[PDB]
Amino acid sequence: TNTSGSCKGRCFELQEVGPPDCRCDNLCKSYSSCCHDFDELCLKTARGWECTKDRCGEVRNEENACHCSEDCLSRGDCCTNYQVVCKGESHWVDDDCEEIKVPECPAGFVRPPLIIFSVDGFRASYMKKGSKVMPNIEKLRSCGTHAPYMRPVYPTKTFPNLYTLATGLYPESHGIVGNSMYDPVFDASFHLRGREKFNHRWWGGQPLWITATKQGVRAGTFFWSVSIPHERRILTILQWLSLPDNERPSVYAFYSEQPDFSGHKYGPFGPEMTNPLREIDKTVGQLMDGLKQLRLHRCVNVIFVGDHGMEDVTCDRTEFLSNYLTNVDDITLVPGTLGRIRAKSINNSKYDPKTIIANLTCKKPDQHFKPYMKQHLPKRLHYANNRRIEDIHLLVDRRWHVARKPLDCFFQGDHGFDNKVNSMQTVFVGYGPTFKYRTKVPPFENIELYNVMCDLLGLKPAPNNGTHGSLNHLLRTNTFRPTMPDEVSRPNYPGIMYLQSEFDLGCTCDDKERHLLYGRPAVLYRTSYDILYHTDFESGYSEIFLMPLWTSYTISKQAEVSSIPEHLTNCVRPDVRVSPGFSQNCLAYKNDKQMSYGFLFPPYLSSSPEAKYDAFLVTNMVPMYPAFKRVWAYFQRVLVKKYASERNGVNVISGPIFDYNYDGLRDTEDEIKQYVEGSSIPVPTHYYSIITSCLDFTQPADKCDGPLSVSSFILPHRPDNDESCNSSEDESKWVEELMKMHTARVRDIEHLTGLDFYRKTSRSYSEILTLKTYLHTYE
Ligand SMILES: *[C@@H]1O[C@H](CO)[C@@H](O[C@@H]2O[C@H](CO)[C@@H](O[C@@H]3O[C@H](CO[C@H]4O[C@H](CO[C@H]5O[C@H](CO)[C@@H](O)[C@H](O)[C@@H]5O[C@H]5O[C@H](CO)[C@@H](O)[C@H](O)[C@@H]5O)[C@@H](O)[C@H](O[C@H]5O[C@H](CO)[C@@H](O)[C@H](O)[C@@H]5O[C@H]5O[C@H](CO)[C@@H](O)[C@H](O)[C@@H]5O)[C@@H]4O)[C@@H](O)[C@H](O[C@H]4O[C@H](CO)[C@@H](O)[C@H](O)[C@@H]4O)[C@@H]3O)[C@H](O)[C@H]2NC(C)=O)[C@H](O)[C@H]1NC(C)=O
Ligand SMILES: CC(=O)N1CCc2nc(NC3Cc4ccccc4C3)ncc2C1
Ligand SMILES: *[C@@H]1O[C@H](CO)[C@@H](O)[C@H](O)[C@H]1NC(C)=O
Ligand SMILES: [Cl-]
Ligand SMILES: [Zn+2]
Ligand SMILES: [Zn+2]
Ligand SMILES: [Zn+2]
């Protein structure tokens, strides 16, 4: 810890120095390890950040913050407006857009550098609403590649999102699950302010700067000390870009605390928000003028990205737990835009999580939060598989806060809500030689950017949650060539091999090209399964799970909906293609006083009364709680036809999911913790459906030319409907709302089932990857 060393010729050095030697890098202040003369040498402020006519051609002065002398360009330390003020050049923003067909890099550069320009709390709508006061940002957006919005991860907080951006991982995977955290194993607490956040034990996965370095690509600093002004951060980046070939980094990051800091105080659209936006734009202009005078403005790839948005949240819109609970002082609450509940540690044996959940469940007619046990949270959130995530979670309504008591105005804005909320959406602009020219791309999730960033730098990405190749349509070149995964298990195609009389399943029945549009799903794990054909549907029957892994069927715009005849209500027929030993039985359901069953292919949509008998095959049967049957029957009887009629037919792929450890991955048979009473029949934790049709709705789903359109859900298989506060009413008043909350990507279903969809289409694989990452938000 020898502070007696000097920073002379070491200001913002890139090589990290360990003890005893003192540091001169930007993180030295944060770790309290700077050399005595760091602030004096490295953080000059004299005469500001802009050149003036009088300073042009000046004699170099060490005291100045930046220089206006003739040697400044070669030294890489001019003020960013030098050539404009002194050499009569124009500002980058005043030039017309010229396509960058190839990188125009100075000799010596191996690849175009990447500059990640990150802005905190920069909401998607600021692009259009603030465009008139942001001309530099408007030029980047209009002449580069932009998305109308980028979806952040849940929680829509800073640390979980910036760390997702760096790693391509969900917060539950990288460990930064919140701005405030408590690890029970460490018995320590992570906070926005404190020295505990500096410990490396909290930060999982592999961030971009580590990915780069491990592959021999030099990485600049991503985290900046708060005391370093934005102008100095920009000048430091430009100085590093002026270094010799063998020392020059290829990846850089800038960070701005704004517009977030002002957003919290004045709300997202507070009149006070114009100044911070003008400021961020001025900083962009400085970077761009700075790159132009270094002849790098047509060589560097720039990413303008946000971490989350900002909502209108006041203290009048606060919900108090003291209005629901008796023991509010006996609980710890992570409050605000989300809620995480923990018991207070000492002499609190009467603490019951079930009582806290029951007392927070549908108590006020206009209640502005909903409690959940973390494993019951919508799967799309990926917010469960981490010990730092408390079991009790409160999903708070947009514009609302949760607090313990009136004890605990100042703020007009906040963020942290569900990542599907409009106000939480952020920005994405890609500008440079590798991005497309004047191109708009569809919205995407920030988990996807890490792979793009690796691709832009020629790196092999570490394993992450992005879908590599899903964002190829953003790039002019340097595209990753994705390949479909190899199918592990081949299917069996059984014929009639069993006699009806061989089946003693305790079942009774008064029975005396079109449906698989995109090829069969590929099974990517080792298992035994049969493909079963029928007039109205096709399935992939699992011998181990004793039910289909998938069921595929097409419903045309004009399909007729029929009812289950009175005499077929309890009909279950044996399937002569599957062994009685590899079949389910009715006696297990009769003996399970809490479990009933349902069917994957809906009997309501049979093409004829004769065809309807196939829907009652024991091989189309799945276990279902009576409460869930209310949801499933309404989906099958009413909603599938509604979608077919609205989308000009639909192709449906339904099936079970098993995720007992809530890690978002397919369970192995040993991970299943519930079976139908005294049977080998596993109980699914969820049920899915993938509903596909033609993007061009003038074309029927079964005769589609061009892109596809999809919507999917992962419904929780619950023994009650406590999640839905109106569940006592008719299903037409609550089932659809439930389903919209549990909307999913095809990719989320793929991880949970070990299946690979859309293997046989007329579309490019890159386009199919984009389709698999699509989330239908209803927002
Ligand atoms: C989102 O994408 C994620 C990434 O792919 C998916 O998460 C992965 O899931 C799998 C399966 O669950 C899991 O695999 C297991 O790994 C076990 C060992 O785990 C430790 O090591 C890995 C790898 O470390 C390497 O990488 C890191 C940087 O990322 C580096 O620091 C290491 O030094 C090491 O380097 C080597 O690789 C890198 C490239 O990655 C090279 O650059 C380098 O040169 C080296 O070659 C770590 O990632 C794990 O990290 C977890 O734990 C630490 C400490 O607690 C946390 O800080 C960290 O945040 C992370 O925590 C999260 O995951 C754990 C589970 O791992 C959760 O419990 C937790 O709640 C968090 O969610 C570990 O330190 C291995 O034993 C195991 O083996 C089993 O299966 C095999 C069959 O293959 C059997 O033979 C065995 O008997 C075992 O049963 C298995 O391979 C990955 O570890 C996990 N990765 C991460 C980052 O979480 C995720 O599923 C996906 N999400 C969805 C929904 O799809
Ligand atoms: C002052 C303040 O609120 N914080 C929290 C976030 C932060 N982030 C960065 N760099 C970021 C980290 C990162 C991660 C990915 C991509 C770009 C960047 C720049 N630097 C400092 C700070 C400090
Ligand atoms: C739950 O509500 C009941 C009835 O209002 C009350 O008796 C009980 O103490 C409450 N429990 C908690 C833990 O808040
Ligand atoms: Cl938090
Ligand atoms: Zn933030
Ligand atoms: Zn904030
Ligand atoms: Zn699992």
Which of 437, 454, 480 lies at the terminal end of a domain, its last residue?
480
Strand 251-259 to 114-120 pairing? parallel
For residues 175 and 20, give the distance between their C-alpha atoms in angstroms, rounded to a whole number: 31
Q: Is 36 helix (H, G, I), strand (E, B) or coil?
A: coil
Nearest to 78 by CA among 239, 226, 305, 273: 239
For residues 374 and 392, give the distance between their C-alpha atoms in angstroms, rounded to a whole number: 6
For residues 741 and 778, give the distance between their C-alpha atoms in angstroms, rounded to a whole number: 9
Q: Is 258 helix (H, G, I), strand (E, B) or coil?
A: strand
Q: Are residues 620 and 749 in the same domain?
A: yes
393 labelled as ligand-binding?
A: no
Q: Are residues 99 and 84 in the same domain?
A: no
- Give me the numbers of helices (H) and strands (E) for the chain, helices first please: 19, 29
Alpha helices, DSSP H only, in 110-266? Answer: 126-129, 135-143, 158-167, 171-174, 208-213, 230-240, 260-266
Ligand 1 pocket member 174 (CB < 6 A):
yes
For residues 196 and 288, give the distance between their C-alpha atoms in angstroms, rounded to a whole number: 36
SS3 content of the chain, % helix, strand, coil (to 5): 30, 20, 55
The domain that holds 181 is classified in CATH as 3.40.720.10
Ligand 2 pocket member 462 (CB < 6 A):
no
Quick one: CA torsion of 62, 67, 68, 71, rounded to 10 degrees?
80
Binding-site residues, ligand 3, Cβ < 6 A: 325-327, 355-356, 359
How far, in Å, from the CA of 310 to the mean position of ligand 6? 8
Cα 208 to Cα 219, 223, 256, 403, 431, distances in angstroms: 9, 12, 19, 37, 19
Q: Are residues 69 and 16 in the same domain?
A: no
158 catalytically annotated: yes
Nearest to 521 by CA among 767, 274, 758: 758
| Experimental method reported for this structure | X-ray
Do residues 429 and 141 lie in contact, with contact meaning Cβ atoms separated by under 8 Å? yes
Ligand 1 pocket member 335 (CB < 6 A):
no
397 labelled as ligand-binding?
A: no
ω into 20 cis (within 30 of 0): yes
For residues 117 and 302, give the distance between their C-alpha atoms in angstroms, rounded to a whole number: 7
- Please state whether 544 falls in left (phi above 0), alpha (psi between -120 and 50) or beta: alpha
How far, in Å, from the CA of 556 to the mean position of ligand 5? 46
For residues 248 and 320, give the distance between their C-alpha atoms in angstroms, rounded to a whole number: 54
Cα 29 to Cα 38, 64, 144, 669, 726, distances in angstroms: 9, 22, 36, 52, 55
Q: Are residues 515 and 608 in the same domain?
A: yes
585 labelled as ligand-binding?
A: no
Do residues 710 and 691 lie in contact, with contact meaning Cβ atoms separated by under 8 Å? yes
Q: Are residues 56 and 74 in the same domain?
A: yes
Q: Are residues 27 and 108 in the same domain?
A: no
Q: Which of 158, 221, 236, 283 is catalytic?
A: 158
Q: Are residues 250 and 165 in the same domain?
A: yes
Contacts of residue 72, Cβ cutoff 8 Å, sequence gap at least 6: 60, 66, 78, 82
Q: Are residues 107 and 78 in the same domain?
A: no
By the CB criterion, residues less than 5 angstroms from ion ligand 5 are: 120, 158, 260, 307
Cα 581 to Cα 493, 502, 575, 584, distances in angstroms: 18, 10, 12, 8
DSSP classification of residue 259: E
For residues 115 and 287, give the distance between their C-alpha atoms in angstroms, rounded to a whole number: 10
For residues 643 and 305, give the distance between their C-alpha atoms in angstroms, rounded to a whole number: 36
The domain that holds 62 is classified in CATH as 4.10.410.20
667 labelled as ligand-binding?
A: yes
For residues 463 and 176, give the distance between their C-alpha atoms in angstroms, rounded to a whole number: 17
Name the strand (E) or helix (H) holding 772.
helix 765-773
Do residues 110 and 272 lie in contact, with contact meaning Cβ atoms separated by under 8 Å? no
Question: Of all protein residues, whose CA lies closest to atom 7 belonging to ligand 3?
Answer: 326
Q: Are residues 668 and 600 in the same domain?
A: yes
How far, in Å, from the CA of 307 to the mean position of ligand 2? 10
Backbone angles phi, psi at 618, to 5 degrees: -55, -25
Q: Is 470 helix (H, G, I), strand (E, B) or coil?
A: coil
Tokens 């004096």, residue located: 40
Nearest to 539 by CA among 578, 570, 504: 578
Q: Which ligand 2 atom is at minimum distance from the Cα of 166? A: 15
Q: Is 139 helix (H, G, I), strand (E, B) or coil?
A: helix
Q: Is 237 helix (H, G, I), strand (E, B) or coil?
A: helix
- Quick one: CA dihedral 355, 357, 360, 362, positive or negative? negative
Which of 445, 480, 515 lies at the terminal end of a domain, its last residue?
480
Q: Is 27 helix (H, G, I), strand (E, B) or coil?
A: helix
Q: Are residues 135 and 49 in the same domain?
A: no
For residues 255 and 258, give the distance between their C-alpha atoms in angstroms, rounded to a whole number: 9
Strand 338-343 to 392-396 pairing? antiparallel
Q: Which ligand is nearest to the CA of 363?
A: 3
Q: Are residues 375 and 434 in the same domain?
A: yes
Backbone angles phi, psi at 355, to 5 degrees: -75, -40
Q: Is 250 helix (H, G, I), strand (E, B) or coil?
A: coil
For residues 462 and 93, give the distance between their C-alpha atoms in angstroms, rounded to a whole number: 37
Resolution (A): 2.4
For residues 66 and 80, give the distance between their C-alpha atoms in angstroms, rounded to a whole number: 9
Number of separate domains in the chain: 4
Backbone angles phi, psi at 767, to 5 degrees: -65, -40
Which of 457, 480, 503 lies at the terminal end of a domain, its last residue?
480
Tell me the residue range of the domain where 689 lies: 481-779
Q: At what angle do helices 274-293 and 135-143 cross, to 10 degrees?
A: 60
468 labelled as ligand-binding?
A: no
- Residue 643: half-sphere exposure toward Cβ, Cα within 13 Å: 24
Do residues 549 and 523 lie in contact, with contact meaning Cβ atoms separated by under 8 Å? yes
Mutate to test the pocket of ligand 3, among 321, 324, 325, 326 (most ligand atoms within 8 A of CB): 326
Cα 579 to Cα 505, 548, 623, distances in angstroms: 11, 14, 19
Question: Of all protein residues, whose CA lies closest to atom 9 belonging to ligand 1?
Answer: 173
Tokens 């000009």, residue located: 648
For residues 229-252, one letter each, b for 16 or more C-beta atoms within 10 angstroms of the residue's C-beta and e for the rest, the string is ebbbbbbbbbbbbbeeeeebbbbb
Q: Is 245 helix (H, G, I), strand (E, B) or coil?
A: coil
For residues 393 and 546, give the distance between their C-alpha atoms in angstroms, rounded to a whole number: 34
Ligand 1 pocket member 169 (CB < 6 A):
yes
Backbone angles phi, psi at 324, to 5 degrees: -125, -35
Do residues 104 and 299 lie in contact, with contact meaning Cβ atoms separated by under 8 Å? yes
Q: Are residues 187 and 204 in the same domain?
A: yes
